[PDB]
A paper describes a structure:
As a model β-strand mediated PPI, we use the GKAP/SHANK-PDZ50 which, plays a role in the organization of synaptic protein complexes and has been linked to several neuronal disorders. There are >250 [name] domains with several therapeutically relevant proteins known to exhibit their function through a [name] mediated interaction. Class I [name] domains bind to consensus sequences with a Thr/Ser in the -2 position from the C-terminus, with the C-terminus hydrophobic residue and free carboxylate being the main determinants of affinity. Here, we used dynamic ligation screening to identify peptide-fragment hybrids linked through an acylhydrazone bond, that are able to functionally mimic a β-strand and inhibit its PPI using GKAP/[name] [name] as a model interaction.
Interestingly, the most potent hybrids formed from 3 and 4 contained the same carboxylic acid functionalized aromatic aldehyde fragments (A047 and A048), indicating that these types of fragments might play an important role in binding. In all hybrids, the hydrazone bond existed in an E configuration with the aromatic ring of the fragment co-planar with the hydrazone. Although this leads to slight uncertainty about the exact location of the fragments, we hypothesize that the key carboxylic acid moiety moves dynamically across a positively charged patch formed by R679, R736 and R743 on the protein surface, making transient charge-reinforced hydrogen-bonding and cation–π interactions which is also consistent with a more favourable entropy of interaction. To provide support for the hypothesis that the hybrids target the cationic patch on the surface of [name], we performed molecular dynamics simulations on the [name]-compound 3-A048 complex using the crystal structure as a starting point. Over the course of three repeats of 200 ns, the aromatic carboxylate of the fragment indeed moves across the surface of the [name] protein, making transient contacts with R679, R736 and R743, as well as intramolecular interaction onto the arginine in the peptide ligand to a lesser extent (see: ESI, Movie S1†). The distance between the carboxylate and these residues plotted against time over the course of the simulations further indicates that the aromatic carboxylate is able to make transient non-covalent contacts in turn with each of the positively charged side-chains of the three arginine residues with a preference for R736.
Residue numbers in the entry: 651 to 681, 689 to 758
Write the structure that this text describes.
């Protein structure tokens, strides 16, 4: 609008179940910190394997990670989030947000 940006924020919470011999099918990457609509979390999905577990559940490149297995990760560093995901083994429940104009 004439007074500032307009955009849509879409929240997605998904349950990922994978087999032992595969990954969840995404690459996590990290971008004193206050979340903003243009920068809602420290970790985001740099890529998502088309047809992989995460893709089939509805996760997409560019999604920002808000929660992992009931723990908020908005302000959590990359290595700690990786450990939280691995702690769940073949199960990952994650909330993400995707921002678009
Ligand atoms: C995890 O594998 C996601 C991809 C990723 O994190 N790649 N990291 C690249 C990188 C790390 C450090 C430096 C540097 O010190 O200049 C450059 C690039």
């Amino acid at each position: 609008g004439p007074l500032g940006s307009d955009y849509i924020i879409k929240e997605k919470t998904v349950l990922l179940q994978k087999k032992d011999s595969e990954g969840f099918g995404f690459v996590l990457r990290g971008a004193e910190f206050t979340p903003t609509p243009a920068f809602p979390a420290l970790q985001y999905l740099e890529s998502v394997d088309e047809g992989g577990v995460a893709w089939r559940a509805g996760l997409r490149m560019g999604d920002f990670l808000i929660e992992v297995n009931g723990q908020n990760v908005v302000k959590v560093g990359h290595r700690q989030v990786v450990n939280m995901i691995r702690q769940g083994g073949n199960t990952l429940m994650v909330k993400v947000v995707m921002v678009t104009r």
